[PDB]
Amino acid sequence: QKPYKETYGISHITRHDMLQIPEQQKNEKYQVPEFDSSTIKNISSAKGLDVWASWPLQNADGTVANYHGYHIVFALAGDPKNADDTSIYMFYQKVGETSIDSWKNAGRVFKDSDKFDANDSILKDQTQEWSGSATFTSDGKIRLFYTDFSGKHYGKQTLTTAQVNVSASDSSLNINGVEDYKSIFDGDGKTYQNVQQFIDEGNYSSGDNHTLRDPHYVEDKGHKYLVFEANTGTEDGYQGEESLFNKAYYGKSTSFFRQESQKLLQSDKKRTAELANGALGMIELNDDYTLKKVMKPLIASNTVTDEIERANVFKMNGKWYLFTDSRGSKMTIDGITSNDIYMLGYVSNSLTGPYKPLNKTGLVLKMDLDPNDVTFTYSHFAVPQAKGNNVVITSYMTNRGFYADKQSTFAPSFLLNIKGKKTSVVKDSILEQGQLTVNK
Ligand SMILES: [Ca+2]
């Protein structure tokens, strides 16, 4: 294979940038702060469930919505004893409240029968509900986006939407049901990998890792978009042996390409790297939330990793910020270890790019605690605020199924300062568990 260079007109998480992170991450400005285990509580309304990846009901710009006096948070939850038991529950608090004890449980968004009543071929094969986002429409509706996962069809993941009908009173919120419940996107082969392409490889025992999940709603100039975790397709730089010879994925220089590519080809990570073709994808939606246009990815991570999760994007003080989470254990970069887990971040003058790295390398947050640590956090997510230079970082705390008495729960939130192309964790900015806004 001859060296070549092709960007496919999109941005890229390069080997050179990633290689800088091990030295850089020793700086406290890029570190998830240490939390105090004796302040940590289970979500009391969730009655012995693990509650992990969660997201707020947001306005179109990403700020936290006020639904008839309440904040709403959707979260994956299930039986700690059953790793494949995952559904979306809806929690809520009166605006102004901050304690984890303020979060009431409206129960599951969906009935088991809803996927059948939807008259949706893909939905009737669903076995779990994985993460997404939720927006509060201009006509006052709760518009959910989430990932339909099918264990019966080799882990197919499909971007899916529903309207959640919720009655509000002075005292409680109550889910009456859903409507407009439909598959929107399951990949197209050319831009984003579909499940058949995963099956073509030999599915799980191939080492490939197919993703199409964590859809995030955002608008710009009245146009509606989802930005999501995916993998590339055949026309925007696919996985394969040929991919290791594309200098676009290396960055820096040809000297660096030669050196780094010959090390990678000689390493035990060659096959992993060939399979790695993560992407943060984008589609425009119609006004009824169906698919308008498949768009080019904002960024891809060919060779580095197959798994860039919890896609997030918003405009803040004149610039666009794009984030994703990723485990060091699934990466191929020298010096990044199986303990390292990241939130990576990118910046642009436009929603559709081009995106360049925050803090020169992409590093925004690093968390390297032992999986057994009660204060281990995952699924970090930057929640934009109405004003100022801070966003709020939410995450879940405590690994699923690890401890009988300590379940996955809302992590203490904290502040991340953002200005220009730089971020820093705000010193001693730890808030309540699950707190969504600075303003009370
Ligand atoms: Ca792949």
From Swiss-Prot:
<keyword id="KW-0328">Glycosyltransferase</keyword>
<dbReference type="GO" id="GO:0046872">
    <property type="term" value="F:metal ion binding"/>
</dbReference>
<feature type="binding site">
    <location>
        <position position="53"/>
    </location>
    <ligand>
        <name>sucrose</name>
    </ligand>
</feature>
<feature type="binding site">
    <location>
        <position position="306"/>
    </location>
    <ligand>
        <name>Ca(2+)</name>
    </ligand>
</feature>
<dbReference type="InterPro" id="IPR003469">
    <property type="entry name" value="Glyco_hydro_68"/>
</dbReference>
<keyword id="KW-0119">Carbohydrate metabolism</keyword>
<feature type="binding site">
    <location>
        <position position="275"/>
    </location>
    <ligand>
        <name>Ca(2+)</name>
    </ligand>
</feature>
<dbReference type="InterPro" id="IPR023296">
    <property type="entry name" value="Glyco_hydro_beta-prop_sf"/>
</dbReference>
<feature type="binding site">
    <location>
        <position position="307"/>
    </location>
    <ligand>
        <name>sucrose</name>
    </ligand>
</feature>
<protein>
    <recommendedName>
        <fullName>Levansucrase</fullName>
        <ecNumber>2.4.1.10</ecNumber>
    </recommendedName>
</protein>
<feature type="binding site">
    <location>
        <position position="327"/>
    </location>
    <ligand>
        <name>sucrose</name>
    </ligand>
</feature>
<feature type="binding site">
    <location>
        <position position="52"/>
    </location>
    <ligand>
        <name>sucrose</name>
    </ligand>
</feature>
<keyword id="KW-0732">Signal</keyword>
<keyword id="KW-0808">Transferase</keyword>
<feature type="binding site">
    <location>
        <position position="131"/>
    </location>
    <ligand>
        <name>sucrose</name>
    </ligand>
</feature>
<feature type="active site" description="Nucleophile">
    <location>
        <position position="53"/>
    </location>
</feature>
<dbReference type="GO" id="GO:0050053">
    <property type="term" value="F:levansucrase activity"/>
</dbReference>
<feature type="site" description="Transition state stabilizer">
    <location>
        <position position="214"/>
    </location>
</feature>
<feature type="active site" description="Proton donor/acceptor">
    <location>
        <position position="309"/>
    </location>
</feature>
<feature type="binding site">
    <location>
        <position position="239"/>
    </location>
    <ligand>
        <name>Ca(2+)</name>
    </ligand>
</feature>
<feature type="binding site">
    <location>
        <position position="208"/>
    </location>
    <ligand>
        <name>Ca(2+)</name>
    </ligand>
</feature>
<comment type="similarity">
    <text>Belongs to the glycosyl hydrolase 68 family.</text>
</comment>
<keyword id="KW-0106">Calcium</keyword>
<keyword id="KW-0479">Metal-binding</keyword>
<feature type="binding site">
    <location>
        <position position="213"/>
    </location>
    <ligand>
        <name>sucrose</name>
    </ligand>
</feature>
<dbReference type="GO" id="GO:0009758">
    <property type="term" value="P:carbohydrate utilization"/>
</dbReference>
<keyword id="KW-0964">Secreted</keyword>
<feature type="binding site">
    <location>
        <position position="214"/>
    </location>
    <ligand>
        <name>sucrose</name>
    </ligand>
</feature>
<dbReference type="Pfam" id="PF02435">
    <property type="entry name" value="Glyco_hydro_68"/>
</dbReference>
<feature type="binding site">
    <location>
        <position position="277"/>
    </location>
    <ligand>
        <name>Ca(2+)</name>
    </ligand>
</feature>
<comment type="subunit">
    <text>Monomer.</text>
</comment>
<dbReference type="GO" id="GO:0005576">
    <property type="term" value="C:extracellular region"/>
</dbReference>
<comment type="function">
    <text>Catalyzes the synthesis of levan, a fructose polymer, by transferring the fructosyl moiety from sucrose to a growing acceptor molecule. Also displays sucrose hydrolase activity. At low sucrose concentrations, functions as an hydrolase with water as acceptor, whereas at higher substrate concentrations it adds fructosyl units to a growing levan chain.</text>
</comment>
